[PDB]
């Protein structure tokens, strides 16, 4: 809350958006720990722990916490680091859990 809200874009996409899948390098991951400087640690669904930058259009536009499903784009020149591109608000995450693009051993439910 606050007087900040009226300065915003007022982009009201409350209705159910169509979830975006993974495309040739964009992959799903889970936030493991929150770091500083606007950077996060994402355990990808491949047995690797990538370091994902909180990225443009996402920095102060959506607020993300520990244990959040996420979509992240890799970089072919440097595999260790990557960029968080989209965030799924815990509803379509269930849908992906049933469809199982990610290993179901990562069970994160409220």
């Amino acid at each position: 809350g606050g007087k900040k809200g009226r300065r915003g874009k007022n982009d009201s996409d409350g209705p159910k958006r169509e979830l975006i899948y993974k495309e040739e390098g964009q992959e799903y991951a889970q936030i493991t720990k929150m770091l500083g400087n606007g950077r996060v640690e994402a355990s990808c669904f491949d047995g690797n722990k990538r370091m994902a930058h909180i990225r443009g259009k996402l920095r102060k536009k959506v607020w993300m916490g520990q244990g959040d499903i996420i979509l992240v784009s890799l970089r072919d020149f440097q595999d260790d680091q990557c960029d968080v591109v989209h965030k799924y608000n815990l509803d379509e995450a269930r849908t992906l859990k049933n469809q199982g693009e990610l290993p179901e051993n990562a069970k994160i439910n409220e």
Partner: protein
């Protein structure tokens, strides 16, 4: 979606820009002729006296 393809792909915009060919471009006089052309175009063929000289006046 949010991003059409993989992000930061080392020259994405240059890769996907439409390659537009050069025009036939008749020969431009060069040397002293270019300076004569500029002198004629600016100081004996004053086109837009209103405002500034406005060389390269965008059409609108």
């Amino acid at each position: 979606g949010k991003v059409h393809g993989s992000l930061a792909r080392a020259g994405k915009v240059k890769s996907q820009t439409p390659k537009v060919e050069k025009q036939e471009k008749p020969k431009q006089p060069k040397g002293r002729a270019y300076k004569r052309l500029l002198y004629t175009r600016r100081f004996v063929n004053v086109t837009l006296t209103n405002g500034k000289r406005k060389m390269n006046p965008s059409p609108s």
